[PDB]
């Protein structure tokens, strides 16, 4: 399909290289968005969680796919973005708690989508390797992501390389009789991993 390769370069260096299907999220008329830190989303699941928590050093690339499941009588549009070094700020104790900074595999719901919860206009969050989802055109999106870092071979339990963000620009709406929540599904597949 219409796969996008971030920055045009692949990472380029059985049991721990397989598809991991995450929890499904429900989309409603009122909704802000969700995000996931990506060096940790899998730090509690499968073999990958075990060898990441044991070994000191880590490096890897990733491939992500987002799927929708709606009908021809629904309407909406989403945006999927990947942000290297996504730091989350706190509005006015100058210290966000652990939950927002390091959410589990289920992610955290956005509080203020307009400023991207970091004072970022969100009208410019397209320089990042993004993609669009329109409920009348298609229902899929794929993204490749190499291993960006300043110092090679960093930690996996004390660092966050990047984050993935999904935001509804246009609001969901429908007519009477239709299901009141389209589901969304996310999958991951580690590629060229090292320890």
């Amino acid at each position: 399909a219409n796969i996008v390769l971030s920055y045009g370069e692949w990472p380029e260096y059985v049991s721990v290289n397989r598809f991991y299907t995450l929890s499904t999220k429900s989309w409603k008329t009122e909704s802000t968005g969700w995000y996931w830190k990506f060096p940790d989303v899998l730090n509690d699941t499968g073999v990958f969680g075990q060898n990441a928590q044991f070994h000191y050093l880590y490096r890897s690339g990733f491939c992500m796919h987002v799927q929708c499941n709606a009908s021809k009588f629904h309407q909406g549009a989403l945006l999927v973005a990947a942000i290297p070094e996504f730091v989350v700020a706190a509005s006015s104790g100058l210290y966000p708690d652990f939950a927002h900074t390091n959410p589990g595999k289920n992610g955290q719901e956005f509080r203020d989508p307009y400023v991207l919860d970091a004072g970022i206009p969100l009208s410019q969050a397209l320089v990042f390797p993004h993609q669009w989802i329109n409920l009348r055109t298609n229902n899929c999106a794929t993204i490749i992501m190499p291993y960006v870092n300043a110092l090679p071979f960093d930690s996996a339990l004390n660092h966050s390389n990047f984050g993935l963000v999904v935001i509804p620009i246009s609001p969901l709406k429908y007519c009477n009789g239709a299901t009141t929540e389209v589901p969304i599904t996310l999958t991951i597949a580690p590629l060229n991993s090292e320890f």
């Binding site: 021809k72 009348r136 620009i169 246009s170 009477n176």
Partner: protein, 221 residues
């Protein structure tokens, strides 16, 4: 050689100057460089990325709702829907895009632009629309029968999902164009389907674009 005489300009410090200074830590060696994937060298190529434009800048609208254009069905066939100017550097709709925030660090610019529209409605919705551009130094059209004469493009969102237009050439400094959206045909809908939709503006620049003078910006934080 030895017979030298000094000349005016001696012992002055000029901020906009480059020369030679001795190192303070001779023999030190820095960390070797490696290959970080992304790299931007030219500042001008950041204006080619298409960002979203804010045309709903009207009081009593806040949040993320200031980014969409509402289109209805009960509206008549011949009337205006929306309009905005072209000036990137000036205040207004072009303040929420990377072209109109990087043109505040310079004074003179010239070239062509690019605007892309996108429709987000139900699959079984059909209709037509009209988009026009009035050249610089004229009057805004009052009827669609007058906007039909100049430069325009028809759009049927029931058969296409996105359309694009290109401005020929603009050049401002420090009266500059206008674009309008008109209705042509109403909005048709089958039973048990919503009667609302939205549009996105998606402004951007072109390959012929130059900046000619450096100055500090004014929109502080």
């Amino acid at each position: 050689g030895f017979p030298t005489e000094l000349k005016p300009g001696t012992n002055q410090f000029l901020t906009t100057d480059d020369g030679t200074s001795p190192p303070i830590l001779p023999g030190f060696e820095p960390t070797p460089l490696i290959h970080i994937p992304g790299e931007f060298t030219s500042l001008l190529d950041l204006c080619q990325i298409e960002t979203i434009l804010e045309v709903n800048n009207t009081t009593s609208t806040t949040g993320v709702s200031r980014l969409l254009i509402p289109v209805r069905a009960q509206n008549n066939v011949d009337q205006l829907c929306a309009s905005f100017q072209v000036d990137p550097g000036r205040n207004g709709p072009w303040q929420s895009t990377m072209v109109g925030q990087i043109c505040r660090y310079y004074t003179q610019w010239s070239g062509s632009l690019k605007v892309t529209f996108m429709f987000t409605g139900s699959f079984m919705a059909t209709g037509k629309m009209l988009i026009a551009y009035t050249p610089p130094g004229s009057a805004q059209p009052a009827t669609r029968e007058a906007a039909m004469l100049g430069t325009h493009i028809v759009w049927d969102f029931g058969l296409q999902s996105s359309v694009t237009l290109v401005i020929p050439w603009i050049s401002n400094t420090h009266a500059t164009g206008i674009v309008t959206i008109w209705y042509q045909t109403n909005f048709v809908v089958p039973p048990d389907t919503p009667t609302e939709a939205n549009i996105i503006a998606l402004g951007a620049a072109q390959k012929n674009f130059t900046l000619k003078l450096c100055k500090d910006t004014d929109e502080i934080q």
